[PDB]
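Hi D.,

Good news: the full-assembly prediction came through. Inputs first.
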Amino acid sequence: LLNCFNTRIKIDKIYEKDYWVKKLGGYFTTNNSNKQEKGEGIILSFERIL
Amino acid sequence: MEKTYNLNDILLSNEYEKIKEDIKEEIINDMASKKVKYSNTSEFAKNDFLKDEFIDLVVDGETYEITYGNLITLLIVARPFNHFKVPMTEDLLFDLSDLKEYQNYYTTLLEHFGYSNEIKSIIKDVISELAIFSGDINVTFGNTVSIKSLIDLGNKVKRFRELLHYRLPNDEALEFNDIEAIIKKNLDEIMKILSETDNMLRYYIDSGAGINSKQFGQVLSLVGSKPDLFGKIIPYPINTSFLRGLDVRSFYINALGARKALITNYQQVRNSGYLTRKISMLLMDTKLIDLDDCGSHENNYLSINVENKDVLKRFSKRSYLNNNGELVEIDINDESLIGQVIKIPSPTTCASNEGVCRKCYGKLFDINKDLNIGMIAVLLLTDPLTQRLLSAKHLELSKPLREIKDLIETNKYIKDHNVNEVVNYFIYLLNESGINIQSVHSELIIREMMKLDDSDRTQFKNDKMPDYEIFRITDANLKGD
Ligand SMILES: [Zn+2]
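Then the structure:
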């Protein structure tokens, strides 16, 4: 949890899901403008794993 | 010469050019007839010149005492009113003896007649006619330089003789700062003596034409201390004037500097200019929209700190949120806004994807609409920076230039700071370096560097500040993919 929380965060976004989706997407895609889409796609693949 | 001239009667007459012609002809013919007399003292010598005689000028019923020369200058520079047939209000009259004010008068002409091409043509004709007459003045009045001119003043004014023959005290207690202080004290006196006496060099000193302070004092009074090859000040100063001669030791010190100047110009050849192409690429596409209000929230408006007088100057012709109301143009002359953070509509925060609005860009919208706005910004920043880097090599003075580049071309400060902090850092960097740019142009560069994380252009009207990420100038080009 502490590793997930970087110091450069605002408390308002912590309770916002789409910020976390974008954070997940950022690992796979460098561009900050498409991050959200990648994250959502990754979630689908995650569900396909099992 | 006639002793009463009605301004707007001649300007709105169809004999406007003929009146100037005969006055211009009369003034130059007078100058050819008589010589100029010099007394080389504070009690000036008398000369019977028409340019210096007085006439009465009637502007809308009000009489001003104006010299014949100021009249012909006024008529030449009031050509707009003959062309447009619109009279000259007394607001537009200015001091015709201080040539600095002419620039501002041309500025008021541009605003009054609407920044049109027609007024742009007339100003060009005014500058042309003013210059052509200057040659006639110069070829008839005459201008000369002589060492006898210096000798003639010193024979009457003992202070000139004593400064022309000045030699430093040989105390070892004197230091580089003490000698440089004596340099200003005796040079400031020299220029004052030349302005307050009837000498052949008086018009040079008062006009500011062909006069450089340092080099003037080295010929007349004292050269001073000089740096060596690597910048260290040589312990021995040059206690002579070029007019009086130099010492063999001093000759070596001068040759060291002249050689150093030559070596420096060889090093100065370096001109990378890589940033010029990068900044131009991002900003070339930015355009303007004929929309008065894009629609933005005051918290989304940019906030800037007016710490210095230099800060307010950068934000002229732009909007400001007064404490009583909202959206009033900031007056740079009012120092009341110094020390107050203020909310400004910014080209960074303009909502419309097509272009930046008239309130966020500023009042320069109609002035710079014909040209490419982004390209105007890149040249206003590049030409100083490229020139400042080269000029600094000759002399912490070089450091501002590097930090300016690091701010926009590296992610050192981009990744951990907001745009409100980024633009204010930019104006701080420009102020220290001496770069004079209105902040709208610098903000447009930051606007394209700024890339929205949210990826929605019109979300700016929402009170919540949009999610975004600033990027490096080369990285922002790469992010397009
Ligand atoms: Zn706008």
